[PDB]
C-alpha cells in the first residue's frame, strides 16, 4: 500500500510527536531505574515511614494514606489524559474525523494507553513517581488497605508481561496511535475513515518493529495480542473503580475522568 | 546567499505549501469571484439549518455557539496543517525539539489569521473546503459577544488582502512568522534567527520579482506581521472570555481538552 519511505516518514513523525507530548519517556525511565548514575537517582518509598519522609524530600493531604496515594495516581492519570489528547491531535487524520468520533476515540482509548505507558515507569519491584524523582515499591502499594491494595497490583501484573516485549519509545509511539484509531469503539459514526487511518499506522508499526527488532520474530502479532487484552484489564479496572466509589465518599473523581466513565 | 539559492528556497516552500494546505488562495479566489460548482451560501438562520444538512459538517454534536465550534474545529485542523508545513522549512527539524514546540505554539494563531484572509472577501468567508460560503453580515450579527468576535478577522482580511499576495508569496511569509526568535521561552535563538534571515532574504527577492511595480511591499508586509501580534492577543483575550462566560461553552471535558 504505502511505500516504505512513506511509512518510515510516518514513524519519525509519530515518535517526534510522542517526545513532544510526554514529559517522562521510557528511555529516561530506564536510565533512572538502571542506575550507574548519581544525578538521576530516585527516593524510594517502601513503607509508611519512608512515605512521610517522602513528602518532604520529593515534594509532590489531610486524608488517610491509601486515599492520598489514590489521588496521586488520579492526578497523574488526569495529566496523562491531557497528554494523550494532545498526542492524538498529531496523528495524521485524527483531527479531520467527525468531532463526535474524536471524543468517542479518546474516551475509550485513554485508559488503554495509560496502562501501556505506565508499564514504561515500572519494573517487577515498583513504579516511578513524581516525574521520576520518586519510586514506590510494588509491595508497599499491594499492602494498602481494604480494596486499594488489589486496585494497584493489576497494573504491575500487566507491565511485567508488557515490558517483556522490550519496546522502546519509537515503537510505543506507533502502537499508542494504533490503539486510539480503533474503529470498533462503541457508538462511532464513520468506522471507515478511522479504519483507513489505522491501516497505515498498522503498516507503519509492522515495518518499524521489523527494522528496530529484526531478531524478534512475530513481535507485531505478539504486540497486537497485548493490545486487545487491554480492553478487559480496563473494564476490570473500571469494575474495581465503581465498587471503590461506593464505599469511599472521600474519593473525588476529576471531571475529565468522570465524563470518561459515564459511558 | 546567492540569488539562485533564494529562488530554490522559494520554490521548495511553495511546493511544500501546496502539499500541506488543501484549499489554496488561488483556488479560494476562483470560487469567491465566480470563476469556477458553486458553494452553498449561509446568510441567515434558515440557510444555516439547510447548510449543515447539505454541506455535512464534522463539528456537529444554540446557533452562535455551533458556528463558534465550527471555527474552533477548523483551526485545530489548520494547526496540524501548519505543523506539517513547518517540518518542510529547511533547518526547522534540526532545531531543539522544545523550540520547535515553542515556535509552533505561538506561531499557529498568526498563521491561521493570515491564511484565513485567503478564504475571505468583504462579504463573507469560505467554509468546508469551499463548498460553503457564510456571509460576513450574518457572522457580524451573532448575539452577545460572538458577533464582535467574528468581525475583527474580516477587518484584518480586507486590509491584508489589499496587498494582493499569492500562494508563492505567502509560502515564504508563513515561514518567516514561524521562525521568530523572540518567542518566550526559546532556548537557542541563534539558529532560529539564522534561518529567518534566509527566509527574509528569499521573501524580499520573491516580492521584487512577483510584484515589480510594488515599492516597499516587503516593508508593508513586515508591518502586517507585527500587527498580527496584537490582533492575536486581543483574540485570545476574547476567546478566553467565551470559554469562561459561556459555561455551556465549557461542554464536554474531553472536548475542552481537545481545544485547550
Ligand atoms: C504520587 O502518587 C503516586 C503513587 C503511585 C503511583 C503514581 C503514578 O501512577 C500513575 C502514573 C502515570 C503516569 O505518570 O504516566 C499514569 C497512571 C498512573 C496510575 N493510575 N492508576 C489508576 O488507578 C488510574 C488509571 Cl491507571 C487510569 C485512570 C485513572 C486511574 C485512577 F484514577 F484510578 F487513579 C494507577 C494505579 C496503580 C499504580 Cl501503581 C499507578 C497508577 C503516583
Ligand atoms: C460553521 O463553520 C465555520 C464558520 C465560520 C468560519 C469557518 C472557517 O473558519 C476558519 C477557517 C480556517 C481555514 O480553513 O483555513 C482557519 C481559521 C478559521 C477561523 N478561525 N477563527 C477563530 O476564531 C480562530 C482563529 Cl482566527 C485562530 C485560532 C483559533 C481560532 C478559534 F479557535 F477561536 F476558532 C475564526 C473566526 C471567525 C471566522 Cl469567520 C473564521 C475563523 C467555519
UniProtKB/Swiss-Prot annotation, chain B:
Organs and tissues of expression: Highest expression in adipose tissue. Lower in skeletal muscle, spleen, heart and liver. Also detectable in placenta, lung and ovary.
Complex formation: Interacts with FOXO1 (acetylated form). Heterodimer with other nuclear receptors, such as RXRA. The heterodimer with the retinoic acid receptor RXRA is called adipocyte-specific transcription factor ARF6. Interacts with NCOA6 coactivator, leading to a strong increase in transcription of target genes. Interacts with coactivator PPARBP, leading to a mild increase in transcription of target genes. Interacts with NOCA7 in a ligand-inducible manner. Interacts with NCOA1 and NCOA2 LXXLL motifs. Interacts with ASXL1, ASXL2, DNTTIP2, FAM120B, MAP2K1/MEK1, NR0B2, PDPK1, PRDM16, PRMT2 and TGFB1I1.
Task of the protein: Nuclear receptor that binds peroxisome proliferators such as hypolipidemic drugs and fatty acids. Once activated by a ligand, the nuclear receptor binds to DNA specific PPAR response elements (PPRE) and modulates the transcription of its target genes, such as acyl-CoA oxidase. It therefore controls the peroxisomal beta-oxidation pathway of fatty acids. Key regulator of adipocyte differentiation and glucose homeostasis. ARF6 acts as a key regulator of the tissue-specific adipocyte P2 (aP2) enhancer. (Microbial infection) Upon treatment with M.tuberculosis or its lipoprotein LpqH, phosphorylation of MAPK p38 and IL-6 production are modulated, probably via this protein.
Cross-link (Glycyl lysine isopeptide (Lys-Gly) (interchain with G-Cter in ubiquitin)): 19
Organism per entry: Homo sapiens (Human)
Disease per record: Defects in PPARG can lead to type 2 insulin-resistant diabetes and hyptertension. PPARG mutations may be associated with colon cancer.
A single MF term (Gene Ontology): WW domain binding
Localization, UniProt: Nucleus; Cytoplasm
Name of the protein in question: Peroxisome proliferator-activated receptor gamma
Keywords: Activator, Biological rhythms, Cytoplasm, Diabetes mellitus, Disease variant, DNA-binding, Glycoprotein, Isopeptide bond, Metal-binding, Nucleus, Obesity, Phosphoprotein, Receptor, Transcription, Transcription regulation, Ubl conjugation, Zinc, Zinc-finger
Induction context: (Microbial infection) Expression increases when incubated with M.tuberculosis or its lipoprotein LpqH; induction is TLR2-dependent (at protein level).
One record GO biological process: long-chain fatty acid transport
Gene of this entry: PPARG
Residue range from the parent sequence: 235 to 502 of 505
Amino acid at each position: 500500500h504505502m511505500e516504505s519511505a512513506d511509512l518510515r516518514a510516518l514513524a519519525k513523525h509519530l515518535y517526534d510527536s510522542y517526545i513532544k507530548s510526554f514529559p517522562l519517556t521510557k528511555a529516561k525511565a530506564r536510565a533512572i531505574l538502571t542506575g550507574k548514575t548519581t544525578d538521576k537517582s530516585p527516593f524510594v518509598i517502601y513503607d509508611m515511614n519512608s512515605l512521610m519522609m517522602g513528602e518532604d524530600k520529593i515534594k509532590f493531604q489531610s486524608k488517610e494514606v491509601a486515599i492520598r496515594i489514590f489521588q496521586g495516581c488520579q492526578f497523574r492519570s488526569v495529566e496523562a489524559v491531557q497528554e494523550i489528547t494532545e498526542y492524538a491531535k498529531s496523528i495524521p487524520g485524527f483531527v479531520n474525523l467527525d468531532l463526535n468520533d474524536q471524543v468517542t476515540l479518546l474516551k475509550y482509548g485513554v485508559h488503554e494507553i495509560i496502562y501501556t505507558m505506565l508499564a514504561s515507569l515500572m519494573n517487577k519491584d515498583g513504579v516511578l513517581i513524581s516525574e521520576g524523582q520518586g519510586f514506590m515499591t510494588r509491595e508497599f502499594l499491594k499492602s494498602l488497605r481494604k480494596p486499594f491494595g488489589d486496585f494497584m497490583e493489576p497494573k504491575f501484573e500487566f507491565a511485567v508481561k508488557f515490558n517483556a516485549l522490550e519496546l522502546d519509545d519509537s515503537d510505543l509511539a506507533i502502537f499508542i496511535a494504533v490503539i486510539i484509531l480503533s474503529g470498533d469503539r462503541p457508538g462511532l459514526l464513520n468506522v471507515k475513515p478511522i479504519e483507513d487511518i489505522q491501516d497505515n499506522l498498522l503498516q507503519a508499526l509492522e515495518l518499524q518493529l521489523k527494522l528496530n527488532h529484526p531478531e524478534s520474530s512475530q513481535l507485531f502479532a505478539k504486540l497486537l495480542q497485548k493490545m486487545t487484552d487491554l480492553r478487559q484489564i480496563v473494564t476490570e479496572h473500571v469494575q474495581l473503580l465503581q465498587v471503590i466509589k461506593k464505599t469511599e465518599t472521600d474519593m473525588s473523581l476529576h471531571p475529565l475522568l468522570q465524563e470518561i466513565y459515564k459511558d
